[PDB]
Amino acid sequence: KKIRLSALEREDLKFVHELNNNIMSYWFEEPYESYRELEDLHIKHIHDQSERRFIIKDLKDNKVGLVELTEIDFIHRRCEFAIIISPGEEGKGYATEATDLTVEYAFSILNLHKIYLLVDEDNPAALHIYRKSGFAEEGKLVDEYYSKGRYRTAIRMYVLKK
């Protein structure tokens, strides 16, 4: 309502790249750095339903941020949720609106069952927002990731349908 979701197109790639310059970034599980890389990967996997991405646009249709549905499995019906918001739009949290919206798309459209996501121990802020979205921790992964000199630990939270 304060925001809308747009299906990612080719013209949106530039914006995506600009975001991830802020860490190893993956496109369909294939890592990339340069724009050209991403550009190629986009075309290559374009018909792959394995993942789905949306651009978050404000009322003015400026590009607010990104949301990624990855690791989609149509048997177990689960996808990994991830969301990124531009450094300018971090003000009154721009996640919940977008977040809860995608969750509907997942359940009410893709007809999925469970959605999960990963967050650092050290990012409590967004950790709450997720819980206020109906998420709850199903696990805590020790040394699951390596970021900035030290193995980090990520919290895995989920939500069911119905």
Name 70's bridge partners: 80
Q: How far is CA 18 from the centre of its chain?
A: 16
Residue by residue, what is the 3-state secondary structure of the chain?
Answer: CCCEEEECCHHHHHHHHHHHCCCCEEECCEEECCHHHHHHHHHHHCCCCCCEEEEEECCCCCEEEEEEEEEEECCCCEEEEEEEECCCCCCCCCHHHHHHHHHHHHHHHCCCCEEEEEEECCCHHHHHHHHCCCCEEEEEEEEEEEECCEEEEEEEEEECCC
Q: What angle do CA 42, 106, 115 make, to 5 degrees?
A: 95
**Structural determination approach:** X-ray
Positions annotated as catalytic residues are 130
Domain ranges of the chain: 1-162
Name 66's bridge partners: 55, 84
Name 68's bridge partners: 53, 82
Name 150's bridge partners: 147
Q: Which CATH class is domain 1-162?
A: alpha beta
